[PDB]
Design an enzyme around this catalytic site. Sequence first.
Site, PDB file in Angstrom:
ATOM      1  CD  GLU A   4      -2.339   4.218   8.007  1.00 31.39           C
ATOM      2  OE1 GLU A   4      -2.292   4.679   9.171  1.00 31.39           O
ATOM      3  OE2 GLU A   4      -2.446   4.939   6.981  1.00 31.39           O
ATOM      4  CG  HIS A  18      -1.716   8.822   2.849  1.00 30.44           C
ATOM      5  ND1 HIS A  18      -1.678   7.435   2.925  1.00 30.44           N
ATOM      6  CD2 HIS A  18      -1.613   9.286   4.113  1.00 30.44           C
ATOM      7  CE1 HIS A  18      -1.528   7.076   4.181  1.00 30.44           C
ATOM      8  NE2 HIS A  18      -1.482   8.202   4.933  1.00 30.44           N
ATOM      9  CG  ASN A  26      -5.726   3.425   8.391  1.00 31.97           C
ATOM     10  OD1 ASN A  26      -5.857   2.428   7.679  1.00 31.97           O
ATOM     11  ND2 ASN A  26      -5.381   4.612   7.919  1.00 31.97           N
ATOM     12  NE  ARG A  86      -2.806   1.652   3.308  1.00 32.39           N
ATOM     13  CZ  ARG A  86      -3.214   2.849   3.719  1.00 32.39           C
ATOM     14  NH1 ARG A  86      -3.968   3.625   2.955  1.00 32.39           N
ATOM     15  NH2 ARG A  86      -2.855   3.268   4.913  1.00 32.39           N
ATOM     16  CD  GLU A 140      -5.195   7.432   9.393  1.00 31.28           C
ATOM     17  OE1 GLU A 140      -4.587   8.503   9.624  1.00 31.28           O
ATOM     18  OE2 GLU A 140      -4.982   6.353  10.017  1.00 31.28           O
ATOM     19  CE1 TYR A 169      -0.715   2.883  13.315  1.00 31.19           C
ATOM     20  CE2 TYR A 169      -2.573   4.247  12.679  1.00 31.19           C
ATOM     21  CZ  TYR A 169      -1.359   3.663  12.372  1.00 31.19           C
ATOM     22  OH  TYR A 169      -0.810   3.854  11.141  1.00 31.19           O
TER      23      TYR A 169
HETATM   24  C1  LIG Z   1      -2.404  17.701  21.334  1.00 28.06           C
HETATM   25  C2  LIG Z   1      -3.122  16.318  21.376  1.00 28.06           C
HETATM   26  O1  LIG Z   1      -4.200  16.275  20.447  1.00 28.06           O
HETATM   27  C3  LIG Z   1      -4.560  15.090  19.750  1.00 28.06           C
HETATM   28  C4  LIG Z   1      -3.516  14.705  18.667  1.00 28.06           C
HETATM   29  O2  LIG Z   1      -4.231  14.332  17.487  1.00 28.06           O
HETATM   30  C5  LIG Z   1      -3.699  13.261  16.665  1.00 28.06           C
HETATM   31  C6  LIG Z   1      -4.611  12.223  16.390  1.00 28.06           C
HETATM   32  C7  LIG Z   1      -4.235  11.141  15.586  1.00 28.06           C
HETATM   33  C8  LIG Z   1      -2.931  11.118  15.039  1.00 28.06           C
HETATM   34  C9  LIG Z   1      -2.653  10.050  14.293  1.00 28.06           C
HETATM   35  C10 LIG Z   1      -1.290   9.783  13.642  1.00 28.06           C
HETATM   36  N1  LIG Z   1      -1.639   8.479  12.994  1.00 28.06           N
HETATM   37  C11 LIG Z   1      -0.557   7.733  12.180  1.00 28.06           C
HETATM   38  C12 LIG Z   1      -0.605   8.012  10.670  1.00 28.06           C
HETATM   39  N2  LIG Z   1      -1.965   7.450  10.253  1.00 28.06           N
HETATM   40  C13 LIG Z   1      -2.176   7.722   8.850  1.00 28.06           C
HETATM   41  C14 LIG Z   1      -0.705   7.235   8.402  1.00 28.06           C
HETATM   42  O3  LIG Z   1      -0.178   8.001   7.341  1.00 28.06           O
HETATM   43  C15 LIG Z   1       0.227   7.301   9.619  1.00 28.06           C
HETATM   44  O4  LIG Z   1       1.430   7.993   9.149  1.00 28.06           O
HETATM   45  N3  LIG Z   1      -2.867   8.253  13.309  1.00 28.06           N
HETATM   46  N4  LIG Z   1      -3.498   9.097  14.030  1.00 28.06           N
HETATM   47  C16 LIG Z   1      -1.974  12.165  15.316  1.00 28.06           C
HETATM   48  C17 LIG Z   1      -2.380  13.239  16.131  1.00 28.06           C
END
Ligand SMILES: CCOCCOc1ccc(-c2cn(C[C@@H]3NC[C@@H](O)[C@H]3O)nn2)cc1
Lengths: 448, 448, 448, 448
Positions: free
Chosen positions: B352, B121, B294, B77, B166, B296
């Site tokens: 993911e 993306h 995705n 991907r 996302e 996590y």
């Molecule tokens: C100040 C605190 O406030 C909240 C922070 O808010 C977020 C929420 C979610 C993420 C986040 C990062 N990822 C990984 C990536 N997913 C797509 C893919 O390209 C990966 O590189 N997922 N979710 C980051 C920040």
Amino acid sequence: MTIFQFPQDFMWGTATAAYQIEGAYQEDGRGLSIWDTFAHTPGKVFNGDNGNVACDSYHRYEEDIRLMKELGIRTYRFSVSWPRIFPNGDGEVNQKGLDYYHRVVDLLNDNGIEPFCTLYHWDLPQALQDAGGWGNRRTIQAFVQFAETMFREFHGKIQHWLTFNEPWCIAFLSNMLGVHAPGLTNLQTAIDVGHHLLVAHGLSVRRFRELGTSGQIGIAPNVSWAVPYSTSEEDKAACARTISLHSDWFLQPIYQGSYPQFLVDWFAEQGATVPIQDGDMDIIGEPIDMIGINYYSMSVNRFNPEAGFLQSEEINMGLPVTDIGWPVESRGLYEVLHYLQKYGNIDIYITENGACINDEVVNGKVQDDRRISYMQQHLVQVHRAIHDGLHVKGYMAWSLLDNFEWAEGYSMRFGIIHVDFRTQVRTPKESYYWYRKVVGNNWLETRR
Amino acid sequence: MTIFQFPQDFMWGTATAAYQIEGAYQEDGRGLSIWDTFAHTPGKVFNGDNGNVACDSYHRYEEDIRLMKELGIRTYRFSVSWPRIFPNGDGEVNQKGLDYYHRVVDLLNDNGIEPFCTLYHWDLPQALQDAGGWGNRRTIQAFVQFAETMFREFHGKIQHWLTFNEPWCIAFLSNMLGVHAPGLTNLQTAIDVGHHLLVAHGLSVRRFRELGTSGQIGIAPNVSWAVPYSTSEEDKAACARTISLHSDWFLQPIYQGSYPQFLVDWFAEQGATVPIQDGDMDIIGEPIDMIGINYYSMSVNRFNPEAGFLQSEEINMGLPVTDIGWPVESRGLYEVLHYLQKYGNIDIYITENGACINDEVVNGKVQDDRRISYMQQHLVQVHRAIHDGLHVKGYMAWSLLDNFEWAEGYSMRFGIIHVDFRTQVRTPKESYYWYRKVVGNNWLETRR
Amino acid sequence: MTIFQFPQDFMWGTATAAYQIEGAYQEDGRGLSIWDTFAHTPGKVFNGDNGNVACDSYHRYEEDIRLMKELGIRTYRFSVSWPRIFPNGDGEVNQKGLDYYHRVVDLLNDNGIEPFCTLYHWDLPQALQDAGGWGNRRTIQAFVQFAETMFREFHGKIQHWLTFNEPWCIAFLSNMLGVHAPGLTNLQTAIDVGHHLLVAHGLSVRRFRELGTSGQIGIAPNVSWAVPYSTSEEDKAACARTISLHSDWFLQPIYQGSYPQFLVDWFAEQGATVPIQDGDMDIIGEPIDMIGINYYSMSVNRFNPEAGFLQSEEINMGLPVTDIGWPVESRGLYEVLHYLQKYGNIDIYITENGACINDEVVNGKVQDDRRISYMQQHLVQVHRAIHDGLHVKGYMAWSLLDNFEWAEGYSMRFGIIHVDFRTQVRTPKESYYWYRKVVGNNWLETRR
Amino acid sequence: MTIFQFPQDFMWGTATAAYQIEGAYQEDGRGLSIWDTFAHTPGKVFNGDNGNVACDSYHRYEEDIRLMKELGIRTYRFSVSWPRIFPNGDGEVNQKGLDYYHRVVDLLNDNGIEPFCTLYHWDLPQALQDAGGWGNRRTIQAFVQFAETMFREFHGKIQHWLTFNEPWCIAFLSNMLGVHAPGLTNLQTAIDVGHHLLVAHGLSVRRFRELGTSGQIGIAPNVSWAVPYSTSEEDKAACARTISLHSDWFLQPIYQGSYPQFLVDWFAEQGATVPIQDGDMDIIGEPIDMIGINYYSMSVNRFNPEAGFLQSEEINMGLPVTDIGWPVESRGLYEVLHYLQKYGNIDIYITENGACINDEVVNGKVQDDRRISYMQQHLVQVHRAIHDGLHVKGYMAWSLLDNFEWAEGYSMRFGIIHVDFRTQVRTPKESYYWYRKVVGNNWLETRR
Ligand SMILES: CCOCCOc1ccc(-c2cn(C[C@@H]3NC[C@@H](O)[C@H]3O)nn2)cc1
Ligand SMILES: CCOCCOc1ccc(-c2cn(C[C@@H]3NC[C@@H](O)[C@H]3O)nn2)cc1
Ligand SMILES: CCOCCOc1ccc(-c2cn(C[C@@H]3NC[C@@H](O)[C@H]3O)nn2)cc1
Ligand SMILES: CCOCCOc1ccc(-c2cn(C[C@@H]3NC[C@@H](O)[C@H]3O)nn2)cc1
């Protein structure tokens, strides 16, 4: 990052058992228990370890109680060596046996620590086991005379009593799987022991009420929680069997005057029945003030016909495990506290909770961060349920001291205080100092 | 201890994104995206990191593909830099943009790796953002011409397409919380972007069908799972709000031609409404072959009025966390796969899944045991759901390479291959070798 | 915590000198300089180190230039070995000398790096020193023919010229204190050399204008800053003397057509006078486009009669020092930039700034955090002054490479790239990678 | 490398505060202070630390005084727990409170250590805070009766008195920023507290004179120094505001019978005024024998409208910082000593100076070289000012012991002696032994 405040009158504690810490196994007329016999049989206990000296708490109780006072703890759960009071369980009492428990208890009360007295923590006298032990109805009479002596002897000195600790271990682990003393492997003699336990319990509660003994009394089951791998009925039933044999099998009779029918049917199909006589269920149903629950781990189980007498196979979900190989999943404690509400909002104490973390003394301290991590997750789940209005009254860390962990010997460390079995030196671990800030503040700050 | 066997045709993969790995941000006529702008603004990205060089995959694609072949992986991907094909998104195409993706894709197909092509993306060209970006219905037509060019250009070369990655991040994280490019903080413009996304998606799926383009197409939402701290209605609603905005808000329209009413009511009370025009819902409801999810992390959330625009407060359960501070609770992946069955037993791919573990090269290798531990728990949950008859078709590890982790820059390592940003040296981590035996055997054994 | 944004057109660079890095001291007809003589005399240079091989940049220039391109630097300040162009400084030119500088400069221009050419970096040919060197007015004509040849030879190839580097070192350190080549110790011959320097400078600037050579030209004094221990007049005067001999003594003549009277009075009382002939001041006052300043350290000084020829005693404030024992107090750079505004808001470049940090290659990299710490404090002071409207146009780190640090030999490392003198291996230090993000972003974030 | 000789009768000392070291927070009738309340409130103090045991100096004072004698120190600055003498600040004295301070003081005098008695070091009784605390004029009467009791009780035993410690902390940190007890955030109640402090001070000095109490009396402001990032008037004013609120705001009234007009104007514009009644300024202007100054750090500040109530933004100049994150720049102590001469050449004592260095016991010693380095730079600046003829009479290291550092808890170590809060073991650090050579020789040799 999050703050968890405990109720004002929440009972903080630490827990031990006579055979695990006391030692002095021949001193002041003590008779052999079934665990003395079992630990002295080759191949029964890892490395041939036994409780002959253990933590030598028989002589070192003054030190252990000083370390409890500095901990700022409120309750201390200990167990009475039956064979210290009745060496043969015959009826001839040992005054030296009683004198020790009076010295221990009197110190606890002078230091403002509330004794929490477990009468039976597996030290059945060998004299009674020679005659069939818990499989014999004669032991029921023997236990009641023991229970009675203690009630009469320590009236007003002790306000919190448990008849039995972990009935599932005493019955099924000890007499079905053969892992614990006296190490039998027969479905029927486990069920027998299990039933006779409950009668002995009921009658001891009855005497407590008749004697108008000071305080409140209960039973302390170890509590399993299992979750099904599949949405399948057969996987759900496997979990139900696993959960019910630890809790429901002893609690449904005490609270609802019956055995779980589905487990009676299950056992009956293996040619075992409960040896129920007239007035047995009436005795067992004698009302109780609280229960203890011992929680450690929870599991994901799938139905499997070749997976022991309950046909319930534990699955390795890849989760991280304590040094004894138990996975840590705190949310089981929350789930089981909600499940137990089937008996109503009863007064529940966590009489045991802890982790096996084998960290030793390095540069004058024990860096048992994993024990702090374990305790942290579990004390959140205790707060979580109190906040749902459940009557969780207290929490007792297993254990005050590294001790004799039964068939694992001294190899598995659960203590909040490190013990060297060469020198009997106590070293409070990092967990001791972390916990001292969780009991004394009476709040918890989850952060790492 | 337990063996988990995967279906014969189960699609093993790794995942990357154009801006995170490509570099060469000014080469061969590439136009600036919103992330170039955002990464070049001080205070937007930790340490002032940007995707200018990243992993230099624009030139090093041959090396990365060789490491995939040796991995024995089945799918790859990747994402297309929109501004490499349409530097201004104006309709003037860049042949050098296409030539790169033809070189990359042609190598993947020669090495028997099936390309899995994410069109968007987060690479929105700055030219379109100058005109209001996704908040302007102009971008919808721009995206469809981009989608179309790729469909016609790589027909028969690519059999697996995702429109968007996302959507919750693109809309709410990027335009409500201001954390991601273009870093706005307005409820209304997020909802706008969210809606315009879905229209652009619908129309692109429509063109795919009209073009009779080779293979299958879908969307890949990031999927949150939250569980209530309390049995209270307010705590259950807080979780529902958290869960629904990530998944339901984009999936209910595509599958059931409406927005979750309870979230429309929630937003309406903050003076926001969806700018829905005639036939929009019809476009959005264009059937799709499958989704990516995705996953996590998972969380325990309490209702709290001052806890952001969703009034859902995450609670720290004291659980262990990845180096980016996310707790690991694999059972959320199982829960959310069951929850998504509300749209029926759709074909789901894990597009993911991964952990941030910042282990570096020590004695010629990366000892990222915590990444293996993470992956192990999660792949059990994938087996667990397949075994419940759910149509989970594949699993793609985030990520093939340590990359530009958006607002965290290079400080958070998610890669299964280590990348030295100093020298652009690739060092397969222990996880790479562990994963290589799971995908090649097509079964998993839990241990550690 | 704080962000410091630099002007759009701010000139980021690194700096070296011919004798310190070139090596090849006898190759392609190079004549011996005074430093070859000095380095070959026992007791003159620590450990008997000399520039015979140095960093072998004469052959390894291609490698060094590649490391500059990857640094994303904008300028490169280097120096020309006079005795490579005029081995005897007699007027017989060496075509091999020029060919090397054409190869070097042509590569710099092809890689979009702007050459910054220092004509004199202490390389005086020994042939001229046999005749009295800079103390003989003969060298003035010799230097101008050298200056002229380079101006005509590299016209349009080089846009930034410096006549002389650190005049105070060339005159007073080299001929009063005897620390540097040619290692004399006579007040009068230092003042002579100092004056003849300025005449040679003036005349070379004049020829540059007459030739209409491409770009801008200046001089690069090393700049001392001293602050009085006491509010006493004597302590303030001691600092004034220390400050003025480094900067004012060469800058007041160029900008205000006179020597600082107070230093002429000071020296006159030791029986020294400036050998100023008719029209000398007119030549010296030839307008210049900008200056370089070399800043390293700052000091607290007390008046002391027995504290050398300036009677200025440096006091040890207990401050932390670089590995060469110089204290780091960045605010001196800010103070001296404000002090130099006495000559108006002239265009200033930081032509040298750096720290001696002797960290070596450990696990494939140099962990020179103290160099990053040093650079960080100093680049704040550069921003601080630009923000006060001072015309600071650029910053050049001393040094690109660990080099021959004069009388300290190879024992003091100032380089931002490690050089193994055993193998001539270049290893970019942590500072190289840190600096690469400051010059490429064109902003700085303070932390640590 | 340089030798700094101190005046013959220079007063070397070490400093503590009652709540930070004493412990025994409930013993011998002690009433709760506002810090007891504050430390017992979740989220107020890091890690939920409190002064309940601290260093247990209430019982261990004999040990601490022996370690002072071996240090060869001349003065010991301690503070009296108000609530130990007046548990409610009501007027009913606690004779057990007095008895402790008589034992402490009598030991100090027998060991030839001169007591330096701070009356108020933030331990306001909670009884008075219930009625509005320092914001109520009733507290002024309460403090004077406390001050009076101590003056009467320890006449001839104590020759050095301070009314209040760090008024800026007591008023603005405690009641404007909410960081310290009682943790309010209102401009007006801080100014109120500030004014009432000065009246209580004046009246206590008046009683001292009326009682003809033995020795000399003063106040000990914490002293900020700020330096402007820019030559701009707005940046200079921001520094002036920062400097004046710490020192001038309390010192201008005592010495010049007025408040700094520019800060009154600044506050008035935020709707706050000083609640000045008739004879208040007359009381505040009651002449004093000396001041203490507490110096730790200095800063570079820029004007910023969004930078708190003083619109003065601290800049990160990239300087190295102590473990608590304060930059070390000794020259601020020199600058502020010169600035304070606006009140004339008053007798100044450094009542606090020290660094947070968290080095622990390793192989039987604390290798706190960074504390020695800090102390070295600062004691040069003390000599430097004495040499300028300023009446700096003494220096007291903060602190004798690692203690309860207020809202940082036990996490930040300032002590010259290490304290283990599990065992209460004292380990003199390297700094203790270094300082022992700086007090006993009465000179300093700056070298590293
Ligand atoms: C100040 C605190 O406030 C909240 C922070 O808010 C977020 C929420 C979610 C993420 C986040 C990062 N990822 C990984 C990536 N997913 C797509 C893919 O390209 C990966 O590189 N997922 N979710 C980051 C920040
Ligand atoms: C072949 C697989 O093996 C089966 C053995 O199965 C078990 C199960 C559970 C236990 C167990 C031990 N504890 C700790 C003690 N709790 C009571 C107290 O006295 C502690 O000393 N709890 N549960 C041991 C063994
Ligand atoms: C016995 C003690 O007596 C005093 C020593 O006297 C000095 C003074 C100053 C230096 C000195 C060395 N540098 C660095 C170089 N700058 C020019 C560039 O080429 C760098 O390689 N600056 N100043 C050395 C020695
Ligand atoms: C959000 C940013 O945060 C603002 C907090 O601002 C401060 C400022 C200054 C201090 C401070 C602490 N000390 C040491 C003590 N001195 C008196 C003595 O009793 C020591 O125990 N001095 N200054 C603390 C906090």
